[PDB]
Design a protein around this ligand. Structure first.
Ligand SMILES: Nc1nc2c(ncn2[C@H]2C[C@H](O)[C@@H](COP(=O)(O)OP(=O)(O)OP(=O)(O)O)O2)c(=O)[nH]1
Ligand SMILES: [Mn+2]
Length: 288
């Protein structure tokens, strides 16, 4: 047989991971198979952080970064050297990798905004430049859909001023993520400076509606435009990832027109599958 053959065996297919909806391991396994083609492009080359709920969303969960030796040997992996040590992460780059994610009850896949880059001579994978910016728009107390959308459109307009395109993704939880592919990749530190400059410019433009800082007392009635996830040490829920919440909602790509809907809400995994069939990947232009 082939040494590099990728195989995953689904166990406990009937096990309910979302008690509120009765969503099972098998549901999740089929979901990740269903979204593989559109999901993979946006996690390719990135260290994948997992959040796992072995007995579902009403039972304890844990983040996992290092790839355990018990994990399939055929999974791609690469190392990040940080201040305190060294971490070797999985890189999910095949449908069977996503099958492994399902089998792990890794409901959530989280990635940074940079990709590993192979050295010309050595071929060793090392962290490379940011390929895209992400903004996390977190609505504060009492912020309406009209305001959050208004703020998203303001971000998009400022980015267009600098020749960039913006893609909205409702997070699956409470807020809204905006991605923009960089014309020239730049260091994560540089990406973070740029993202910060954008958030501060918007805050200057609409200080009643937007904050660029974490400070808790300034949050009420404002959208927090979080630029800090562009840090190379930070990770953000991957597009098409499930969320480990009461319902199986998804970090779902949207159209700008959809954000114009006052009835805007998070989308469930079944809706996301139907939308892929109809429209393909709304994020097709974000990566590759
Ligand atoms: N403890 C821990 N926290 C993490 C890690 N990676 C990311 N986080 C935090 C920072 C991210 O903002 C967050 C990802 O999911 P959250 O629900 O907290 O933020 P998200 O923007 O997805 O939801 P929202 O739209 O604000 O309701 O988790 C990690 O490895 N360990
Ligand atoms: Mn948020």
């Amino acid at each position: 047989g082939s040494a590099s053959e990728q195989r995953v065996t689904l166990t406990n297919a009937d096990k309910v991971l979302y008690p509120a909806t009765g969503t099972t391991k098998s549901d999740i396994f089929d979901y990740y198979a269903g979204v593989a083609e559109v999901m993979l492009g946006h996690i390719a080359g990135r260290p994948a952080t997992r959040k796992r709920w072995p007995n579902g969303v009403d039972q304890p969960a844990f983040f996992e970064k290092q790839l355990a030796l018990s994990a399939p040997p055929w999974l791609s992996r690469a190392t990040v050297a940080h201040r305190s040590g060294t971490t070797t992460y999985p890189i999910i780059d095949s449908a069977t990798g996503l099958a492994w994610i399902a089998q792990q009850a890794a409901l959530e896949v989280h990635v940074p905004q940079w990709r590993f880059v192979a050295e010309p001579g050595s071929g060793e994978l090392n962290p490379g430049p940011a390929t895209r910016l992400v903004f996390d728009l977190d609505p504060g107390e009492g912020v309406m859909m009209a305001q959050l959308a208004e703020v998203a459109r303001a971000v998009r307009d400022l980015l267009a001023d600098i020749g960039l395109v913006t893609f909205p993704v409702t997070s699956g939880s409470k807020g809204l993520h905006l991605y923009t592919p960089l014309d020239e990749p730049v260091s994560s530190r540089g990406a973070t400076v740029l993202a910060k400059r954008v958030a501060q410019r918007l805050e200057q433009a609409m200080p009643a509606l937007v904050t660029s800082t974490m400070t808790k007392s300034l949050r009420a009635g404002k959208v927090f435009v979080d630029w800090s996830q562009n840090s190379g040490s930070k990770t953000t829920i991957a597009p098409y990832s499930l969320r480990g919440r009461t319902h199986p909602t998804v970090a779902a790509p949207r159209t700008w027109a959809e954000l114009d809907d006052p009835a805007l809400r998070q989308l469930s995994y079944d809706e996301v599958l139907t939308r892929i069939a109809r429209d393909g990947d709304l994020l097709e232009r974000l990566d590759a």
